[PDB]
Design a protein around this ligand. Structure first.
Ligand SMILES: CC(=O)N[C@H]1[C@H]([C@H](O)[C@H](O)CO)O[C@@](O)(C(=O)O)C[C@@H]1O
Ligand SMILES: [Ca+2]
Ligand SMILES: [Ca+2]
Length: 448
């Protein structure tokens, strides 16, 4: 229709960009300055997940609203098939700091074979990364100095990237397959930040010691974006979707969050903790032993009063939505199944939108609208209060009033952003692991 905008796709990442053969897992975010940041996995040896790859994190920026993009940079690169996989972007509006978080595995490890726990040990009230030698002896890293089990200083030190130094000379990296001292083979959550609008980034912080429990095997970023709460008692809290497995391998979603501008982090409960299933059975993420109630990758949005909604990948075939009254610390016992939105067991994107649509607060949603990874569809969901919970809190559901096919054929992971002009940017997997496509759409298009 006249005035509708749906730009022709641009291959924002593609084979050969930054000398990477493959790409997957988009994240897209507009900074407070108006810059678009796109992050992605630069998968160097094909499309496969860790551990069958060597994956780096790449970033591109656009200062002109997505019309032109920079030459990119690699911001995290570990050696020897140690991978960083699944990025997420968020910003602290009060400081201007941009955060990127990602899951990190040492060489040989990934989702399926992650070891139990954080990889840290408490010594006299501080958490220290453990290292292991060839015989299984345990060491700790204390302010980047390696101590043996008897609390004697060794000749080894580390840095934030895991390089291993013997008397100040680099000999290996604790994430490699060859180092004489290795980190535990499990997932770690890495955090980097930028104070210059994404131009430069810090070296990673390993926040596992704060967010990963002793009974979790995998704990990973749920890729896409986070939020900063705008309304209510938890205003300012930075919320980052995650998911984990228990000792039985079963997956549950959650959020990690920070009340101090990213300095310290906490993991909240899962919606699977004290979840009431359809006919009244109560489960818990620690004990979940069945595949059917699993909740995996997820993205979060905020309701007008500050209530959180966690949109989750799951095994029901349809969207699942959890509700939190307390800023992501806990969730209501009922997980909604929204049978108006197919969910083929794939990542999804959902964002708040800044302007009302048809008199209602609205969200924008993207996923493959099928029983397979196809029929990529962007939706406008109008928020309606439908009653109240027993505790008096408002109960909100979505009216998926506008639903637009944007990508016939293959469509897998995606990430949305609102643009400075009120339009919508979208970065999506329109191929399995090669070209990653960026488009801009306006609401005239989406509503047509
Ligand atoms: C850390 C990791 O493996 N992340 C990968 C996840 C997990 O394997 C599943 O969510 C486990 O259930 O799934 C993908 O394979 C997928 O479905 O396309 C891509 C993503 O990079
Ligand atoms: Ca690498
Ligand atoms: Ca609960």
């Amino acid at each position: 229709v006249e005035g509708a905008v749906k730009t022709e796709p641009v291959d924002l990442f593609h084979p050969g960009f930054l000398n990477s053969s493959n790409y997957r897992i988009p994240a897209l975010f507009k900074t407070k300055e108006g810059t678009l940041i796109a992050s992605i996995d630069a998968r160097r040896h094909g499309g496969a997940d860790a551990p069958n790859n060597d994956i780096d994190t790449a970033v591109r920026r656009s200062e002109d609203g997505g019309k032109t993009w920079d030459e990119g940079q690699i911001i995290m690169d570990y050696p020897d098939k140690s991978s960083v996989i699944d990025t997420t972007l968020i910003q602290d509006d009060e400081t201007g700091r941009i955060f990127l978080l990602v899951t990190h595995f040492p060489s040989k490890y990934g989702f399926w074979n992650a070891g139990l726990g954080s990889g840290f040990k408490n010594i006299d009230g501080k958490e220290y990364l453990c290292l292991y030698d060839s015989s299984g002896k345990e060491f700790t890293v204390r302010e980047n100095v390696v101590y043996d089990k008897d609390s004697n200083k060794t000749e080894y030190t580390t840095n934030a990237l895991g390089d291993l130094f013997k008397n100040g000379t680099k000999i290996d990296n604790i994430n490699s397959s060859t180092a004489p001292l290795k980190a535990k083979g499990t997932s770690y959550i890495n955090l980097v930040y930028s104070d210059d609008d994404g131009k430069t980034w810090s070296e990673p912080q390993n926040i596992n010691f704060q967010v990963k429990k002793d009974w979790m095997k995998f704990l990973g970023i749920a890729p896409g974006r986070g939020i900063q709460i705008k309304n209510g008692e938890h205003k300012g809290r930075i919320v980052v979707p995650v998911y984990y497995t228990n000792e039985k391998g079963k997956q549950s979603s959650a959020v990690i969050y920070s009340d101090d501008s990213g300095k310290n982090w906490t993991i909240g409960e899962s919606p699977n903790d004290n979840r009431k299933l359809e006919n009244g059975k109560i489960i818990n993420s620690k004990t979940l032993s069945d595949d059917a109630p699993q909740l995996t990758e997820c993205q979060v949005v905020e309701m007008p009063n500050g209530q959180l909604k966690l949109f989750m990948r799951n095994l029901s075939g349809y969207l699942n939505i959890a509700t939190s009254f307390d800023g992501g610390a806990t969730w209501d016992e009922t997980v909604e199944k929204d049978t108006n939105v197919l969910e083929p067991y794939c990542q999804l994107s959902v964002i708040n939108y800044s302007q009302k649509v048809d008199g209602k607060d609205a969200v924008i949603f993207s996923n493959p609208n099928a029983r397979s990874r196809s029929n990529g569809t962007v939706r406008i969901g109008l928020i309606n209060q439908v009653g109240t919970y027993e505790n008096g809190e408002p109960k909100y559901e979505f009216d998926w009033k506008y639903n637009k096919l944007v990508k016939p054929g293959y469509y897998a992971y995606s990430c949305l952003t609102e643009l400075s002009n009120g339009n919508i940017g979208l970065l999506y997997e329109g191929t399995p692991s090669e070209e990653m496509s960026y488009i801009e759409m306006n609401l005239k298009y989406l509503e047509s």
